[PDB]
Amino acid sequence: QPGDDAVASMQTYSVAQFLQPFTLNPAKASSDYLGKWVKVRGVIVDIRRKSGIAGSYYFIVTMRDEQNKTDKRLTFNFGSHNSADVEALSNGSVATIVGQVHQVQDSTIPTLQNPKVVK
Numbered sequence: 001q002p003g004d005d006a007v008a009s010m011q012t013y014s015v016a017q018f019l020q021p022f023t024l025n026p027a028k029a030s031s032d033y034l035g036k037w038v039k040v041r042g043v044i045v046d047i048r049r050k051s052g053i054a055g056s057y058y059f060i061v062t063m064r065d066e067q068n069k070t071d072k073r074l075t076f077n078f079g080s081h082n083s084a085d086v087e088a089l090s091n092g093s094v095a096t097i098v099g100q101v102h103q104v105q106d107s108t109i110p111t112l113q114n115p116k117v118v119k
Helices: 004-008 015-024 026-033 080-086
Strands: 012-014 037-051 057-064 074-079 094-100 111-117
Touching: 012 015, 015 026, 015 037, 015 074, 057 080, 057 094, 074 080, 080 111
Parallel strands: 012 037, 074 111
Antiparallel strands: 037 057, 037 094, 057 074, 094 111
8 A cells, every 4th residue: 555655655546537547448547557556536425334354344435526527436445453444534624545456347438446535
């Protein structure tokens, strides 16, 4: 996972910007981004705790473009160990979250993994 100074050093994408390549070809985009970390800024529109498999639970955080420059939403999957970050977000509030691209299947939009709320 990237630490604070590595995070401050990354470019901030809008949701529209990060999703643009996936809109063109998600197979290609998923392959180009595989394993990479992105820092995406947007408005949180849903936060939800979910029942996991094998005793676990996790959270899905959904984000829309800050200026509605796309209607597509980006989701992030936070494990139970990062409930502090999830509990500090707010629906309707702008946030910036760093997350990792894992393989995108059965979908055209990635669900960012191992996320970290920046601000």
